[PDB]
């Protein structure tokens, strides 16, 4: 793989229904997925919507070892340790960028993405008003589906690694 390409990837964890967010939070806890997320994104640029930035406790922000970028329409938004952009036009300039949520920003970034790393959580959360949702992937995406695994908590999950040209 010759150097010099600008890879844009999407990474998310979803319930079976496609629910990714509820009440300004992720409605489950899966440490194994946090470790997975960290592993994929480490050393790269991460892009997130303002609501996702807000969803992170101040104590953990900006996420370590990564260039944190926050998308907002508020020119005066204060995001300590991160940069704020007002469109994705200049958010995808890095050699490798991972869009890390939330629902709105996934929809905005998907047309530029060539990788998707999805954690599917076997939890039956029906979609509710106000939920953040995963994007729907079309038939252009291909890749490897992982085997089901139990987390330490008993929650069942599996990993999808998708890509396309
Ligand atoms: N399960 C997962 O993998 C995962 C990952 C990340 C987040 N989440 C969850 O998802 C939820 C957040 O997702 P969300 O869809 O509500 O919000 P989001 O995509 O994180 O953020 C939306 C905000 O981004 C800014 N924005 C959106 N479109 C824009 C555009 N075209 N130009 C400029 N700025 C734009 C706006 O910020 P301003 O309002 O400041 O203008 C908007 O309010 C939370 O519940 C979070 O916990 C889940
Ligand atoms: C030790 C706690 O670590 C943190 O606070 C950061 C991890 C974290 C934990 C808890 C809640 C949110 C969170 O981050 C919300 C942004 C990332 O969301 C994603 C994502 N885009 N893709 C995947 N596969 N998983 C997650 C969540 C780990």
UniProtKB/Swiss-Prot annotation:
NADP(+) binds at residues 12-13, 20-25, 49-52, 71-74, 86, 100-105. Residues 7-164 form the DHFR domain. One of its GO terms (biological process) is dihydrofolate metabolic process. It is an enzyme of class 1 (oxidoreductase). It comes from the Bacteria. Pfam families: DHFR_1. GO terms for molecular function: dihydrofolate reductase activity; NADP binding; NADP+ binding. Inhibited by isoniazid metabolites. The prodrug isoniazid is metabolized to isoniazid-NADP adducts that inhibit the enzyme at subnanomolar concentration. Belongs to the dihydrofolate reductase family. This is Dihydrofolate reductase. It comes from Mycobacterium tuberculosis (strain ATCC 25618 / H37Rv). The gene is folA.
């Amino acid at each position: 793989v010759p150097r010099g390409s600008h890879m844009v990837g999407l990474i998310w964890a979803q319930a079976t229904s496609g629910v990714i967010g509820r009440g300004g939070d992720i409605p489950w806890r899966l440490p194994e997925d946090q470790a997975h997320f960290r592993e994929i994104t480490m050393g790269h640029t991460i892009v997130m919507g303002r609501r996702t930035w807000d969803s992170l406790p101040a104590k953990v922000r900006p996420l370590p070892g990564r260039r944190n970028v926050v998308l907002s329409r508020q020119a005066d938004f204060m995001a300590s340790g991160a940069e704020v952009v007002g469109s994705l036009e200049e958010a995808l300039t890095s050699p490798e960028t991972w869009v890390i949520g939330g629902g709105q920003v996934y929809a905005l970034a998907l047309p530029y993405a060539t990788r998707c790393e999805v954690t599917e959580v076997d939890i039956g959360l029906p979609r509710e008003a106000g939920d953040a949702l995963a994007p729907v992937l079309d038939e252009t995406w291909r890749g490897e589906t992982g085997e089901w695994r139990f987390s330490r908590s008993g929650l069942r999950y599996r990993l999808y690694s998708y890509h396309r040209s």
